[PDB]
Write a protein that binds this DNA or RNA. Structure first.
Lengths: 475, 274, 193, 188, 665, 62
DNA sequence: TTTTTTTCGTCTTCGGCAAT
DNA sequence: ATTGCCGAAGACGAAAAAA
């Protein structure tokens, strides 16, 4: 019976003296006792099923957060907190929802419900500043106990939620990676007990994974929309944070004056003289530029901007590369936003795009993704398949796009487009993209021709024009 | 009563007039059907007569009993008529008529067993050349012939009927070709054969239309022509490919042109004469 | 087949048939229709009545009976052919009398059936003739009786104008069809009702 | 059936509450469709008769068909009404006054009838409706109401006082039973 | 010649429930059939004992309910004799206060010191003086020879009198109708009148004088008996009534033979000195005055002995007798009510009263002033005379199946009996509402009287969703006017910021009997709105009387808040303490259950009985507590009924589905 | 002018693939046999036997 | 000067390209 | 059929300007 049972720490492992012979592990591996990774503590179901239990004799009895107030979440988000009360730590650990519908609120509520000494992990200071703005109803004595805790200073019991910090490892003053042995953990190194991770996909990377791996970490919750990069690490995240409690929030459940029905499309474009000579012959990182700048595909992108500007729709055009961004945008003479565009000029372009009926198309680089207040529109065009993440295409679509007025309850009232060059490595991304969007509940189709592109003025009207671009791209 | 002959007569007239070339008769024959009919009909021209012959048995479906027996009486006359008459259209008519008499159950199994008509249905059934349209009436006749026999205890015909066995080679063909219609007809024969004598005998798909398109991709099998002696012989030989519609390309400044393989020979012949 | 069904066919004998030019054919067709009707179910029965100019008369009396029915009908009609009430000598027919006979028979059959379960019956009139004012009270009396009885009276007008019959179907909830193309008689009988 | 002649004024509720999906999407579609079935069945059983059609909509009365003996006008009017739908609230008093004006003209042995399909709860008319009900009973104009899920007392009294036919309809099957009850003639 | 199958089934058991000769409790329907079936069940005993024949008396809350008892009982008798009658050769007759029956006697002697008892004395005095000699100049034109005339005598037994129609008879004729009834009371087998008259032991002694023989009393809606009995038992004094009695004694010319140290006027001054000094010292905003507090200011000021006080009490009676004879020759009562209140004060009634003084009206230079009384804390002592040997009782309230509260209130154990055949649960539907998603947090009701967000959210919004969706005539009951005013913005809003916009009608204070009917005419005629229709009313208020229309004028009632009550920091607080000492479990019995019956009367009045149908919804956070102990109508009546359950994932849909089911029936 | 005839296969292509074929022709092993000549930018005279290879190789190649 | 704004520099994921 | 050594692109502090 476990009334005497010791349990202790060595470098990244838990060893269990004079044992109760617990299920699901090897025995006398190198001594009479059981020995697991720290990170295996998460498997509380394997003892719970057996009817086994354990005690935290290493406890520290100091004080904790109360945060008694409540607020109102979206109808699936509440169902999602309700479930978490239901399931408990044996059968909980991540939630997936867009970066534009209430993820900050799920984190402050997840900490106010769970109610333990908490450390909040985030990607960015702006997101700390948005979580502070969310958290003001729970904040103790409004503004006299909230503080930041990162590379310049630390103070107070709370802040953006409870104490927030960043994932970073540049040196001794990052935030979470350097401190990973000092505090956290109620069961050993026992100052705190609860972990809340915003942007949770960020942690299972090869160096970062160690922050999570080198503890027992009692309670853990993660929140994300991108969830994984193109190589799919996500089997690891079940171990590292916990299993996935939720994924859906389909626009099928929020149509009639609720949000927006998106017609998704992929566009197959043919390939014009000289560009495949050179695509086929070049194996280097330049070849990405011949399939993105393919003038038949540029003419589809131009034709599509013209159709939706003729109807006065608002359009964001995404370009994965600053070269591509500027070659498309300067030709189409639409503003662009990227790293080196300043805050003053970005807020002028974005205010113009949202409120000026003359400024209806803009071009944007990777800087929108992960922490950025992208504006509203009704049309999204991606000039390329990029291998960033199929799941980030759906986060980006979901934050940016809304219903066009009066048609607010129809089958579609917003539009997404991804442009693909036929007979290239750009095509490989489609059978995955298509399967992921339809599994996310989206109506998605393939458009393979445009015989009305043969009825109007567009660029690259000759071989000589196309040759002028081909020489510039090759250089 | 007097009206009866007159009214029906007018349609008899109409059928008579456009009797020869096409297939006008079918609709009119049906009307005619209701209102020694067979004996009298026999004198009239064959086509159309057969049409009337075909539909009348169908139309039967007390006094009715009398009608069937009456029909049975001159089943021979129609049978004599059926043979002797024996295009695809005619052929369709003869078996359709025979089939119809068969369902009526008026025909004598004996007599039918040894007759040219049964040989003729399997003959067309055997030949690959026959069209789908002839096939379906031939098939139907066979099915009906077997249907007619609800015994086989006394039915010599269910011997000749065995002639279906010959059909398997035909079904192999037909299968080789993508002729679904023909195969289905075969199966009906088999199934019907077994029936009579059974006692005696012991998104996702988006990539699938793309994978279909990956099996089609172009080029042409082709003769090129060069080193032409003077421009008049390019232009003659070129114009004589263009009227044959088998120019794939031409360039008068090269004195060079291309013909796909199917009109190599009409060009080789024109190059020899003129 | 669970429900016994009696279909009474009243045939208008009027010499209007002369205009028809044929009665013999009409009989043949009616016979075919009857045979089919009897064949459909064991429980089906048929009664045939002739509404002649002078009076109404019973044609015959199950499908096993059909042979009997055929003979009885052919013979009965031939007797009817008599010269009196010839051509439009008499335009009208005694439908009221025929309907009365039909309801009596239906009633008798029903009582016997009452011993058992319910019976369903409907009356079909093949009408050649014209209605007359004198006829109105008598015909309507029979019609209303049928409606109360909930016995539908269907009518197939080969020719002539019997308004009362048209009204009869409406009240009765039956079906009325004025046939274009009288030779299509068989189709109407089978298809129409 | 023949014996006498009927005059019937069919009155339909074209108020907004009628555009509700509770019965045949927007009650309007299910009621007009069954009412077309009723006209042909009533005209059949009642070959010597007349009907006229009125609606109450957007706080007024409108004449969809004039009083006549040809069924075709009334099914064509029920077809033409469905496209223009329903909005607003009843005008029952003005509809009983136009119906009264047509019905008063009719001779001694013919019936006087008003059939109302009702999905509202009151009516917009200022005029005193009780004076008009007293006048219907003197004139021998009988008024029947088929209501949808509704028993509001002035309508029920109005149908009882004029002759005894306030009925409730809860399905498309029940509404066909009620109209088919009306198809039935009066005694003579 | 017959009676109901129900009466036959439950007669023997009801005769047995009656045999115990002292008490019993009876379960009956929500109202339709209850009172008539009682008369049918007393037909079994209309002459149980020939040598004494007991009588029936019925107690009633208001005058319109009395005409409902008379009209039903008039149908049942059809006449006093076999000549036209066939169940009961009985005589029955309505009654109510002299204050209601007679207008001219209220009008003519216009003075503050003019009690309704005193006015009968005055009218009697004018009648005797006129008879003596004084007919030409002094009768009060309402009492004379018509009192004993045959024409006056006949309508009462021929007719079987209604109270309203006795008042209509009584005006025009100009004869005091109350006295003719009071003379007539002994001949009658049955009587219908007030609960406020009967519960009062001193009036009960005079009521029993008029009956002249033993009887049974039936309390219809008997949960009212306790609040009426303490209101009626308690007595009080008023500063203006002494200031008038003092002028009247000085006008009498006092006396001429009290000893030099004292006089009647000086003695009043001693008494008045004590009460006047408590007016300054005691209370202004609130009180906590006990039966202990009065004696000490009496004892210090007077410096007296008993002999002297006994004499001062005797000398007060003698000034009062002089005054009473002197009032009588005047023919148009404070010296009497002062003689006695002072006698009770020097004596006792400490086993049954406690003296309180209460804030006055200042405020203004008025004379109503702080009021002083002998407040009856608890009814139990006051009720006892009902059970005593000249009588027996029987109690009912429609439903009462959980039984316990009545024996709790009585401190006696009646014979119990359920004595009607009930109908299936399915004709009724009893919903509760609180919210439908997890974000619906505005209904904490820690301060429901102050929670604006909660009033604006499902309290205002669910009402509008339910009323707009369920388009029928529906009355929304509220716990107070202030809630009612905040919830419906109406035409007349308490603020610009209020959250219902829809055509409803109001039912506010200064209700008027004629104005009430206008609103019920509107609700019965058409549209959502009217009285009992889409209209707001507080559940305590007059709409609870209802209307006796045949038409099912009501459909749904939505109680916006569960009807709840409070407990004033005075005599009521003293009562809460007593019942805590005795029961423990006092709060649910003393307040919650008593408020839920307040609810149940209004819903009972909507659905009426077995021959009707209906639903009734409750809006509250704490509503499960209300569902336990069968404190609402939802509770058991017959095991075979297949339950009266209300749980659903959506109330509004379930009631519209239930209305389709009801149209189908 | 019927001087010379040559059986060959005529490949019609767009302004982006024919270039790949030429590249296929050179820089290849066992190749360079493939294209007879470039008649037009769009069309080439090529192969015969090679056509199966050219198509397949193009398929396999991007 | 203080305080703020830019560029520089370090750690790390990911797609090729040789080399065992 | 695996290890192992570039180049490219992105993110976070911190040093260096600039006032």
């Amino acid at each position: 019976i476990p009334m005497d049972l010791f349990d202790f720490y060595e470098q990244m492992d838990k060893d269990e003296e004079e044992e109760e012979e617990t299920q699901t592990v090897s025995f006398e591996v190198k001594q009479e006792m059981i020995e697991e990774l720290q990170k295996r503590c998460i498997h509380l179901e394997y003892p719970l099923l057996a009817e086994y239990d354990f005690r935290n004799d290493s406890v520290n009895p100091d004080i904790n957060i109360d945060l008694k107030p409540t607020a109102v979440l979206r109808p699936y988000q509440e169902k999602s907190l309700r479930k978490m009360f239901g399931n408990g730590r044996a059968r909980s650990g991540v939630i997936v929802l867009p970066c534009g519908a209430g993820k900050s609120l799920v984190g402050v509520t997840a900490a106010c419900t769970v109610r333990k000494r908490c450390l909040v992990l985030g990607n960015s200071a702006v997101s700390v500043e948005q979580w502070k703005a969310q958290f003001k109803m729970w904040s103790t004595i409004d503004d006299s106990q909230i503080c930041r805790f990162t590379s310049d200073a630390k103070d107070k019991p709370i802040g953006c939620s409870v104490a927030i910090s960043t994932y970073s490892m540049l040196g001794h003053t990052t935030k979470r990676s350097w401190e990973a042995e000092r505090v956290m953990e109620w069961l050993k190194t026992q100052e705190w007990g609860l972990m809340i991770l915003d942007e949770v996909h960020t942690i299972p990377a090869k160096m970062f994974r160690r922050v999570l791996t080198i503890v027992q970490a009692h309670c853990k919750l993660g929140l994300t929309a991108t969830l994984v990069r193109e190589d799919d690490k996500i089997v690891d995240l079940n171990f590292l944070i916990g299993p996935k409690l939720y994924e859906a929030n389909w626009m099928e459940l929020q149509n009639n004056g609720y949000i927006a029905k998106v017609q998704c499309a992929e566009v197959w474009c043919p390939m014009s003289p000289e560009f495949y000579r050179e695509y086929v012959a070049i194996k280097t990182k330049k070849r990405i530029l011949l399939y993105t700048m393919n003038p038949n595909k540029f003419r589809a992108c131009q034709f599509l901007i013209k159709f939706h500007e003729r109807r006065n729709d608002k359009i964001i055009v995404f370009a994965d590369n600053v070269f591509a961004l500027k070659e498309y945008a300067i030709r189409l003479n639409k503003p662009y936003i990227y790293g080196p565009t300043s805050q003053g000029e970005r807020m002028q372009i974005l205010q113009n795009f949202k409120h000026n009926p003359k400024i209806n198309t803009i071009f944007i680089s990777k800087v929108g993704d992960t922490s950025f207040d992208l504006p509203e529109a009704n049309v999204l065009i991606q000039i390329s398949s990029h291998g960033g993440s199929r799941r980030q295409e759906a986060q980006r679509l979901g934050r940016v796009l809304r219903a066009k007025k009066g048609m607010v309850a129809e089958e579609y009232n917003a539009f997404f487009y991804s442009l693909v060059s036929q007979d290239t490595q750009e095509m490989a991304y489609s059978t995955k993209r298509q399967r992921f969007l339809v599994d996310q509940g989206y109506s998605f189709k393939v458009i393979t021709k445009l015989a009305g592109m043969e009825e109007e003025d567009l660029a690259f009207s000759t071989k000589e024009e196309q040759q002028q671009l081909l020489q510039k791209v090759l250089a | 009563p007097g009206v009866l002959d007159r009214l029906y007569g007018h349609p008899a007239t109409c059928l008579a007039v456009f009797r020869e070339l096409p297939s006008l008769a079918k609709n009119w024959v049906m009307r005619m059907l209701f209102l020694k009919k067979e004996f009298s009909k026999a004198q009239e021209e064959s086509t159309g007569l057969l049409s009337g012959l075909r539909i009348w048995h169908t139309q039967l479906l007390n006094l009715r009993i009398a009608l069937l027996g009456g029909g049975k009486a001159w089943s021979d006359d129609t049978s004599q008529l059926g043979p002797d008459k024996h295009v695809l259209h005619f052929m369709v008519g003869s078996p359709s008529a025979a089939v119809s008499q068969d369902l009526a159950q008026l025909l004598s199994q004996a007599g039918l067993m040894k007759s040219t008509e049964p040989g003729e249905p399997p003959c067309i059934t055997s030949a690959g050349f026959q069209f789908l349209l002839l096939d379906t009436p031939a098939q139907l006749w066979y099915f009906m012939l077997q249907y007619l026999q609800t015994a086989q205890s006394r039915g010599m015909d269910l011997v000749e009927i065995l002639s279906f066995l010959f059909q398997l080679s035909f079904s192999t063909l037909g299968k080789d070709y993508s002729v679904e219609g023909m195969s289905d007809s075969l199966l009906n024969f088999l199934q019907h054969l077994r029936e009579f004598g059974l006692v005696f005998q012991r998104t996702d798909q988006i990539r699938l239309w793309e994978l279909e398109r990956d099996r089609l991709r172009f080029t042409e099998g082709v003769l090129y022509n060069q080193f032409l002696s003077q421009v008049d012989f390019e232009l003659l030989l070129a114009h004589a490919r263009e009227l044959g519609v088998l120019v794939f390309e031409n360039s008068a400044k090269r004195l060079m042109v291309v013909t796909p393989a199917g009109h190599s020979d009409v060009k080789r012949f024109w190059k020899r004469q003129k | 087949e669970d429900e016994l069904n009696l279909l009474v066919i009243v045939v208008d004998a009027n010499p209007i048939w002369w205009g028809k030019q044929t009665l013999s054919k009409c009989i043949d067709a009616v016979m075919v229709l009857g045979n089919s009707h009897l064949f459909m179910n064991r429980s089906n029965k048929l009664a045939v009545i002739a509404s002649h100019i002078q009076e109404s008369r019973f044609l015959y009396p199950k499908y096993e009976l059909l042979t009997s029915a055929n003979e009885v009908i052919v013979e009965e009609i031939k007797d009817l052919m008599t010269k009196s009430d010839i051509k439009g000598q008499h335009t009208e027919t005694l439908l009221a009398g025929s309907l009365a006979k039909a309801l009596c028979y239906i009633h008798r059959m029903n009582k016997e059936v009452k011993d058992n379960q319910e019976m369903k019956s409907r009356i079909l009139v093949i009408k050649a003739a014209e209605d007359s004012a004198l006829q109105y009270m008598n015909f309507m009396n029979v019609i209303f009786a049928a409606q109360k009885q909930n016995i539908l009276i269907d009518a197939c007008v080969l020719d002539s104008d019997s308004g009362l019959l048209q009204q009869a179907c409406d009240i009765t909830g039956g079906l009325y069809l004025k046939v274009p193309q009288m030779p299509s008689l068989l189709q109407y009988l089978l298809w129409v009702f | 059936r023949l014996g006498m002649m009927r005059h019937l004024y069919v009155v339909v509720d074209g108020s907004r509450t009628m555009e509700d999906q509770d019965l045949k999407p927007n009650r309007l579609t299910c009621t007009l469709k069954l009412l077309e079935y009723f006209v042909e069945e009533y005209f059949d059983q009642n070959p010597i008769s007349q009907i006229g059609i009125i609606v109450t909509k957007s706080k007024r009365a409108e004449k969809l068909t004039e009083l006549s003996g040809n069924p075709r006008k009334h099914i064509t009017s029920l077809k033409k009404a469905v496209d223009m739908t329903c909005h607003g609230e009843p005008s029952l008093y003005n509809s009983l006054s136009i119906a009264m004006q047509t019905l008063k003209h009719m001779p001694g042995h013919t019936s006087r009838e008003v059939l109302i399909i009702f999905s509202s709860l009151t009516t917009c008319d200022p005029s005193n409706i009780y004076d008009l009900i007293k006048t219907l009973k003197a004139a021998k104009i009988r008024v029947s109401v088929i209501g949808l899920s509704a028993e509001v007392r002035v309508c029920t009294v109005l149908a009882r006082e004029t002759g005894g036919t306030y009925h409730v309809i809860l399905d498309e099957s029940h509404y066909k039973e009620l109209l088919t009850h009306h198809v039935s003639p009066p005694p003579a | 010649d017959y009676i109901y199958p129900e009466q036959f089934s439950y007669m023997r058991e009801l005769k047995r429930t009656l045999d115990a000769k002292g008490h019993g409790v009876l379960e009956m329907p929500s109202g339709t059939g209850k009172t008539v079936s009682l008369l049918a069940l007393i037909m079994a005993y209309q002459r149980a004992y020939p040598l004494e024949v007991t009588k029936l008396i019925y107690c009633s809350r208001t005058v319109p309910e009395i005409e409902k008892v008379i009209e039903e009982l008039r149908k049942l008798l059809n006449f006093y004799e076999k000549q036209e009658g066939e169940k009961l050769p009985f005589l029955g007759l309505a009654l109510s206060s002299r204050k209601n029956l007679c207008i001219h006697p209220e009008v003519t002697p216009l003075r503050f010191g003019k009690d309704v008892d005193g006015k009968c004395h005055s009218l009697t005095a004018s009648y005797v003086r006129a008879q003596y000699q004084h007919d030409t100049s002094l009768p009060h034109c309402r009492f004379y020879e018509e009192f004993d005339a045959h024409g006056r005598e006949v309508p009462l037994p021929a007719g079987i009198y209604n109270l309203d129609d006795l008042k209509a008879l009584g005006r025009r004729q100009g004869w005091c109708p109350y006295f003719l009834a009071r003379y007539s009371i002994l001949h009658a087998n049955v009587v219908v009148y007030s609960y406020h008259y009967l519960l009062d032991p001193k009036i009960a002694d005079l009521v029993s004088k008029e009956l002249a023989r033993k009887a049974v009393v039936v309390f219809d809606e008997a949960h009212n008996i306790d609040n009426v009995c303490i209101d009626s038992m308690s007595v009080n004094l008023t500063r203006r009534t002494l200031d008038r009695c003092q002028g009247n004694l000085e006008t009498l010319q006092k006396t001429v033979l009290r000893i030099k140290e004292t006089d009647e006027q000086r003695l009043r001054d001693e008494y008045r000195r004590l009460v006047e000094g408590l007016r300054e010292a005691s209370a202004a905003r609130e009180t906590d005055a006990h039966l202990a507090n009065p004696v000490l200011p009496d004892e210090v000021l007077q410096e007296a002995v008993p002999g002297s006080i006994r004499t001062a009490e005797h000398f007060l009676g003698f000034l009062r007798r002089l005054l009473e004879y002197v009032k009588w020759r005047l023919r148009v009562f404070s010296p009497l009510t002062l003689l006695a209140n002072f006698a009770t004060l020097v004596s006792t009634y400490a086993k049954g009263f406690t003296i309180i003084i209460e804030p006055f009206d200042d405020r203004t230079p008025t004379i109503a002033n702080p009021i002083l009384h002998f407040s009856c804390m608890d009814a139990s002592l006051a009720i006892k005379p009902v059970f005593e040997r000249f009588q027996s009782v029987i109690i009912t309230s429609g439903t009462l199946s959980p039984l316990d509260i009545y024996p709790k209130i009585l401190d006696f154990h009646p014979v119990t009996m359920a004595t009607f055949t009930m109908t299936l649960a399915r004709v009724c539907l009893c919903p509760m509402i609180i919210g439908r998603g997890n974000d619906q947090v505005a209904i904490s009701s820690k301060f429901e009287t102050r929670e604006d967000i909660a009033v604006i959210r499902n309290y205002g919004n669910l009402l509008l969703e339910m009323s707009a969706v369920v388009p029928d005539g529906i009355v929304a009951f509220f716990t107070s006017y202030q809630y009612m005013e905040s919830t419906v913005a109406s035409w007349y809003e308490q603020g610009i910021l209020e959250n219902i916009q829809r055509n409803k009608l109001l039912f506010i204070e200064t209700q008027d009997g004629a104005e009430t009917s206008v609103a019920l005419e509107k609700y019965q005629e058409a549209c959502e709105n009217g009285r009992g229709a889409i209209l707001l009313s507080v559940a305590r208020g007059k709409v609870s009387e209802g209307i006796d229309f045949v038409h099912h004028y009501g459909r749904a009632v939505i109680m916006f808040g569960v009807p709840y009550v409070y407990t004033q920091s005075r005599i009521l607080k003293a009562r809460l303490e007593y019942l805590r000492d005795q029961f423990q479990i006092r709060e649910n019995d003393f307040l919650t259950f008593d408020a839920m019956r307040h609810a149940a009367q209004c819903v009972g009045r909507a659905i009426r009985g077995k021959t009707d149908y209906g639903l009734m919804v409750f809006a509250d956070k704490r509503f499960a507590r209300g569902d336990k102990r069968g404190k609402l109508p939802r509770w058991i009546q017959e095991h075979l009924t297949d339950a009266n359950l209300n749980l659903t994932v959506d109330e509004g849909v379930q009631v519209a589905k239930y209305f389709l089911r009801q149209m189908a029936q | 002018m019927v001087n010379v005839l040559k059986g060959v296969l005529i490949e019609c292509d767009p302004a982006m693939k024919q270039f790949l074929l030429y590249l296929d022709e050179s820089n290849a092993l066992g190749k360079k046999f493939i294209i007879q000549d470039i008649d037009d930018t769009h069309v080439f005279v090529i192969a015969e036997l090679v056509n199966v290879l050219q198509e397949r190789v193009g398929e396999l190649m991007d």
